[PDB]
Amino acid sequence: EGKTMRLLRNKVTDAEIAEVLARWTGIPVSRMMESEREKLLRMEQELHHRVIGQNEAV
Amino acid sequence: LKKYTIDLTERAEQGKLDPVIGRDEEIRRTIQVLQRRTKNNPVLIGEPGVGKTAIVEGLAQRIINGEVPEGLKGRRVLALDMGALVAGAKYRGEFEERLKGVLNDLAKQEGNVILFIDALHTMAGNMLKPALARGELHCVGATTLDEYRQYIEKDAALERRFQKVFVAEPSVEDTIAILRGLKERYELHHHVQITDPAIVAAATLSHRYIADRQLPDKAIDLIDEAASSIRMQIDSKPEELDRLDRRIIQLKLEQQALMKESDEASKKRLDMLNEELSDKERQYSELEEEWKAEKASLSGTQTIKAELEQAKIAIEQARRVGDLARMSELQYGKIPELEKQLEAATQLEGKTMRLLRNKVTDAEIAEVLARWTGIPVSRMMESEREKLLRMEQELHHRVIGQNEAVDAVSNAIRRSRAGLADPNRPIGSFLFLGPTGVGKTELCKALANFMFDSDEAMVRIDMSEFMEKHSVSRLVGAPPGYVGYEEGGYLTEAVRRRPYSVILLDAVEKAHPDVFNILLQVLDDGRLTDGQGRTVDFRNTVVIMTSNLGVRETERKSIGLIHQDNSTDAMEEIKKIFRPEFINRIDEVVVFHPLGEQHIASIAQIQLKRLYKRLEERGYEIHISDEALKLLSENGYDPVYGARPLKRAIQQQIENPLAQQILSGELVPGKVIRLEVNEDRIVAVQ
């Protein structure tokens, strides 16, 4: 199974456990795989869409 | 009378009774109450566990030992058995058939029978009244304090009849006497022995610590559970026996692995395995032979235990019924022979018993108790004076800094626990000056963890906390008899976990002089009459009182300069603002200071120890320089609060950029980080 099991992996990891818990509690699961810094570096402007200005507040 | 009532002449005559010890006051009060012409149904205020049924067993030892007075002799006392009265009831209503038949024959008996109701509070209620009120019978009762208070006072003829007797739980040496009087049944029933300091330490320490359970009840739990532990583990085979048993069963299975062979010349090596098998079988046979030798000592002492209890029961029944030749026959004759070879049997266990230990000492009590409670046994092996003189060492294990606080506060605690103040005071009469966040809560956790054994033990009071005059009514909750029996007092919660407390009475000077008088009643008398009026013992409470008067000059006078200067010129302000009575109350004046330069570096690296472990789990190791942590320090050193924007400037100045640099991909894990030295904004470099 180390050689010919290309598609399926029968052994388990901790990332599956964190994904089942993330589907449970309703926390966003996409903090790791989805690009977090691409929207987190523009949190200022995403707030500027409705709360514009206030540089020290953000 | 017969089929559903039982004469206590033959129950006390049969001797179903445990031995009793010196129960004078309650039994003589029972006599004089039972000689009243009416209300001669005495009710004993108490709970079982003081031995009220055993006090009745001892009044039956004063009937059957003849020690009752002229009033209560000749009376033929028959006990009701409701557990016998349930017999013969199939269709609905035959228990009260046989119960009112008991009212028939105890109605015709007309005073001959005193009744004893085992568990009086079984005895319904409208139908127990007319027979006693006409006078058709004669009884005695017993019940719980709270059950009694909800029992007599309301109804007219019920408080006419049922009667109060003070029966209580004894002091130290009397429970010691009860365990001495019961080590007959303990030793001669439990295959154990009992010495005197086990009884004294049991009744004494059980008297002192647990104010919950009963005496000698919890000592009966100790002798009963632990004595059966000694009997049970004596029944077990010793330790070298089953060490060798595991080794011989592994060696026999390996010999079976050696006998089944395919290649002969490689697998016929097992000769040395066979001679080692023979040697270990010889040693195991000799050790289990020693176990049977101790079982031979226990065989002879077992049958002489049986004939021993038969012999002292024989001499006591010889005292009772009175055969002439049998009394002197046993007195000079059979029983001192069994005393002498009883001593030879104690030497038989004194020379045969090597592996198994027949005698019970305090160490097996420390086994059963050390697996009862779970508090560390070293804390009982600690004394007070040793953890007073060696307090600086373990205070310098966890907490860094505060030298004159540990030494001078340690002088106040050595004086306080030594008794060098007024013993009508609380424990620590302190006065602390300094800012917040330098370790006051950490000092409460450290002292709480050392002498109080908890990382959970502190409640703190700033004077703006103050839950009000109504709030003492809030911790009593509803008055008793209203809604809220589900919770009642949260006193039960915050005092469920901590009966003591370490309290951080912040800003004592900024409070009102009424808090100089309420807190004067705190420092004096070792107890405070609170806002409700009752008072609770502060003598088991360290009254740590902190303050924030002189912040800036204390934040300066920390490095290089002596700190007695800051203490004494602080007392130049304390003498003006206080009365000299408060200066008389506290022993010394301690002022906390923000730490020195290398110790500020210790503060910042300890606040970064969370980053060392949070990151060493994820795979990052910082080796932060003193200069990057120094830019954390002097970019954190705002003279407003002290070290409180220092965490704000560490986590905000580096760690939010370090979360952007670690979480963006600039810092690759598995590599050692050194927080380097660039421009004043700090950027981590791989």
Side-chain angles (χ1 to χ4, degrees):
Chain A
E1 290 177 353
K3 289 180 182 179
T4 190
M5 291 295 290
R6 185 182 66 189
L7 292 175
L8 274 71
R9 294 182 182 91
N10 52 2
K11 75 276 193 185
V12 300
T13 59
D14 52 358
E16 295 291 327
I17 316 296
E19 283 177 351
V20 174
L21 184 61
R23 291 181 66 249
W24 285 359
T25 62
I27 183 177
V29 66
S30 294
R31 292 189 292 116
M32 291 177 69
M33 185 176 177
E34 185 68 27
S35 180
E36 185 181 0
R37 303 278 78 76
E38 196 271 332
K39 66 181 183 182
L40 262 281
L41 264 293
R42 63 178 183 179
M43 190 193 294
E44 294 87 2
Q45 186 180 2
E46 289 290 327
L47 290 171
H48 283 292
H49 283 89
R50 55 183 291 164
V51 183
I52 205 165
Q54 298 295 318
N55 295 319
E56 187 178 0
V58 303
Chain B
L1 295 177
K2 294 290 187 180
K3 303 289 285 186
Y4 300 99
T5 310
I6 290 94
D7 194 0
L8 286 173
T9 301
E10 76 182 7
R11 286 189 69 184
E13 185 178 1
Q14 274 167 356
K16 291 188 281 187
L17 314 174
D18 287 329
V20 302
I21 296 93
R23 298 177 183 272
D24 196 1
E25 299 177 356
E26 50 267 10
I27 290 177
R28 183 63 61 87
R29 177 70 178 174
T30 305
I31 297 297
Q32 189 179 359
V33 167
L34 282 172
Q35 280 181 348
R36 281 179 173 172
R37 79 176 189 261
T38 58
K39 69 182 291 186
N40 54 9
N41 301 319
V43 187
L44 300 177
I45 300 170
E47 290 85 2
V50 73
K52 303 188 273 78
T53 303
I55 290 171
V56 178
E57 288 176 353
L59 192 277
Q61 282 192 359
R62 292 173 185 177
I63 292 169
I64 210 62
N65 287 318
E67 303 172 355
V68 292
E70 291 287 327
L72 277 77
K73 67 183 290 184
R75 294 181 178 181
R76 306 189 78 185
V77 173
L78 278 71
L80 183 143
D81 191 3
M82 183 266 179
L85 279 163
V86 296
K90 294 299 290 183
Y91 294 94
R92 195 261 299 164
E94 294 186 358
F95 167 70
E96 287 84 0
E97 166 196 358
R98 303 191 183 192
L99 187 62
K100 77 179 182 181
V102 166
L103 193 66
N104 288 119
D105 62 358
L106 288 176
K108 70 99 179 176
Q109 192 59 253
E110 292 175 352
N112 194 5
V113 170
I114 299 178
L115 189 66
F116 169 69
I117 305 161
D118 197 1
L120 179 74
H121 75 274
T122 60
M123 279 290 182
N126 282 322
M127 63 177 286
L128 262 291
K129 291 176 182 178
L132 285 163
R134 294 171 192 173
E136 303 179 3
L137 68 157
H138 193 277
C139 69
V140 172
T143 189
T144 302
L145 273 72
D146 294 332
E147 292 289 324
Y148 192 73
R149 292 177 179 178
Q150 67 186 356
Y151 185 67
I152 58 159
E153 189 67 31
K154 300 297 182 291
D155 191 355
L158 288 184
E159 69 176 357
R160 288 187 182 97
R161 301 293 100 182
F162 294 107
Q163 192 270 333
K164 299 184 284 289
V165 169
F166 297 106
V167 181
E169 187 180 3
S171 67
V172 175
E173 301 173 356
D174 194 77
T175 308
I176 289 166
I178 297 170
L179 298 171
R180 291 194 184 101
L182 288 171
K183 67 194 288 185
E184 177 187 2
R185 307 292 180 88
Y186 295 160
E187 292 174 350
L188 281 83
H189 186 73
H190 291 284
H191 288 84
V192 298
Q193 292 296 110
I194 291 177
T195 187
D196 286 331
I199 281 175
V200 172
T204 306
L205 296 171
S206 72
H207 180 79
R208 182 179 179 180
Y209 287 101
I210 300 170
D212 290 333
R213 291 187 186 273
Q214 295 72 235
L215 291 179
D217 188 10
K218 67 192 89 168
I220 293 167
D221 302 335
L222 293 174
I223 296 172
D224 200 355
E225 170 173 354
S228 186
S229 303
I230 271 92
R231 189 184 68 250
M232 181 177 284
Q233 285 179 355
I234 277 167
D235 292 331
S236 67
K237 193 176 75 175
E239 287 293 326
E240 293 178 353
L241 275 301
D242 68 2
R243 297 287 188 183
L244 289 173
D245 198 1
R246 297 294 182 268
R247 296 180 71 186
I248 63 171
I249 193 166
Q250 285 295 110
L251 201 149
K252 282 182 180 293
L253 289 177
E254 191 176 0
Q255 187 176 2
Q256 182 63 41
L258 262 291
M259 287 185 285
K260 184 178 261 76
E261 55 90 19
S262 65
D263 291 330
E264 184 175 2
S266 296
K267 295 295 291 295
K268 289 299 291 183
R269 192 259 183 88
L270 74 157
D271 197 0
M272 59 89 204
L273 192 67
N274 195 0
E275 62 91 21
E276 289 289 328
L277 190 275
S278 295
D279 196 1
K280 295 293 178 68
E281 287 294 328
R282 286 179 291 171
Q283 185 65 41
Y284 177 74
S285 296
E286 289 179 353
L287 289 179
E288 194 175 4
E289 181 68 29
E290 185 181 2
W291 186 64
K292 290 294 182 72
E294 288 186 354
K295 287 174 71 174
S297 175
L298 264 66
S299 70
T301 205
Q302 185 69 42
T303 61
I304 208 166
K305 273 177 185 291
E307 298 177 355
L308 183 64
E309 181 72 27
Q310 292 299 109
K312 286 295 182 183
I313 288 171
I315 194 63
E316 288 292 326
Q317 289 293 320
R319 291 175 184 176
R320 287 183 180 92
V321 61
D323 194 2
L324 293 175
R326 193 62 52 84
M327 285 186 288
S328 178
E329 175 179 356
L330 292 173
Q331 282 174 354
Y332 285 165
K334 291 183 179 180
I335 75 170
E337 179 182 1
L338 294 171
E339 288 178 353
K340 288 188 263 74
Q341 67 184 358
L342 180 61
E343 294 291 327
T346 59
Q347 291 183 357
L348 180 64
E349 287 182 352
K351 272 87 174 65
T352 52
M353 301 307 297
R354 184 177 180 180
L355 296 169
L356 299 170
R357 306 295 184 183
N358 280 317
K359 189 182 286 186
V360 177
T361 184
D362 295 332
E364 292 287 323
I365 305 299
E367 293 192 0
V368 177
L369 185 62
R371 294 175 290 179
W372 276 7
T373 63
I375 293 170
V377 298
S378 295
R379 290 289 191 268
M380 292 186 288
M381 289 299 292
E382 286 177 355
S383 66
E384 184 66 32
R385 53 178 288 165
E386 189 70 30
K387 72 191 290 180
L388 282 170
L389 269 72
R390 295 192 294 114
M391 189 180 290
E392 293 83 4
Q393 186 176 2
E394 189 68 28
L395 278 177
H396 284 87
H397 278 173
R398 293 186 71 187
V399 179
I400 47 95
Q402 287 87 17
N403 289 319
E404 192 180 1
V406 170
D407 290 330
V409 164
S410 179
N411 290 320
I413 296 169
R414 282 189 293 269
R415 286 175 293 174
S416 180
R417 301 288 184 181
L420 293 176
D422 196 4
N424 295 115
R425 294 186 68 88
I427 302 165
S429 66
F430 289 107
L431 174 60
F432 291 110
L433 294 169
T436 311
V438 297
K440 295 193 292 182
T441 66
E442 190 72 30
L443 185 64
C444 296
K445 287 185 286 186
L447 293 176
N449 206 165
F450 180 71
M451 71 185 76
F452 293 115
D453 303 334
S454 178
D455 275 328
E456 297 178 357
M458 186 195 76
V459 61
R460 67 177 294 164
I461 293 170
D462 46 352
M463 299 297 172
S464 295
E465 187 183 7
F466 177 71
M467 59 290 197
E468 285 80 5
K469 293 286 287 186
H470 188 274
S471 301
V472 65
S473 297
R474 292 190 295 175
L475 64 135
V476 311
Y482 289 165
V483 73
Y485 190 73
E486 188 179 3
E487 191 68 29
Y490 57 91
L491 180 66
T492 63
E493 300 290 328
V495 187
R496 203 279 297 268
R497 282 191 298 273
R498 298 297 174 271
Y500 63 94
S501 62
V502 54
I503 311 168
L504 200 69
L505 280 86
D506 300 328
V508 58
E509 287 84 358
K510 262 63 186 299
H512 200 272
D514 287 330
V515 190
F516 288 173
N517 290 319
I518 288 170
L519 184 145
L520 184 61
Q521 290 185 358
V522 171
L523 288 175
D524 278 326
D525 293 331
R527 64 174 63 88
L528 171 64
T529 58
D530 61 355
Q532 197 63 256
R534 82 279 301 275
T535 183
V536 183
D537 201 3
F538 277 164
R539 293 173 296 177
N540 295 117
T541 300
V542 185
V543 287
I544 289 171
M545 299 173 185
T546 61
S547 180
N548 297 112
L549 293 174
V551 54
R552 293 180 64 88
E553 58 90 19
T554 304
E555 287 180 356
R556 182 176 178 179
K557 296 181 185 293
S558 66
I559 299 168
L561 182 61
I562 58 170
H563 193 73
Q564 187 182 2
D565 193 1
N566 208 166
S567 178
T568 52
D569 69 359
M571 289 181 71
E572 293 291 328
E573 185 179 2
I574 293 166
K575 184 178 75 173
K576 185 181 287 291
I577 195 65
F578 280 107
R579 293 188 296 272
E581 283 87 5
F582 181 80
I583 307 166
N584 290 317
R585 295 295 86 82
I586 58 175
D587 294 329
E588 290 181 353
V589 171
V590 180
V591 44
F592 285 164
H593 65 90
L595 271 299
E597 291 181 353
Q598 63 182 358
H599 295 169
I600 283 173
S602 178
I603 289 169
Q605 76 180 359
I606 280 168
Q607 289 292 109
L608 289 169
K609 281 289 174 70
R610 290 196 296 269
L611 196 58
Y612 286 118
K613 300 296 184 289
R614 283 167 185 265
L615 283 182
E616 85 172 6
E617 287 178 354
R618 295 291 91 193
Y620 292 93
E621 180 183 1
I622 299 173
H623 288 169
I624 187 167
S625 65
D626 53 355
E627 194 171 5
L629 188 143
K630 184 177 174 67
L631 290 175
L632 292 175
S633 297
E634 67 180 0
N635 283 318
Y637 185 73
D638 194 0
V640 181
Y641 296 103
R644 304 187 75 181
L646 187 273
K647 174 67 174 177
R648 296 171 70 91
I650 286 176
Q651 73 182 358
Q652 186 178 5
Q653 278 173 353
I654 63 166
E655 294 182 354
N656 287 310
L658 188 62
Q660 298 307 111
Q661 287 166 358
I662 286 174
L663 271 298
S664 179
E666 184 172 358
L667 273 72
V668 178
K671 299 295 182 182
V672 177
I673 295 97
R674 187 261 181 88
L675 284 174
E676 292 181 355
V677 281
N678 275 323
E679 295 89 2
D680 293 329
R681 183 177 174 92
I682 299 170
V683 172
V685 178
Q686 290 296 110

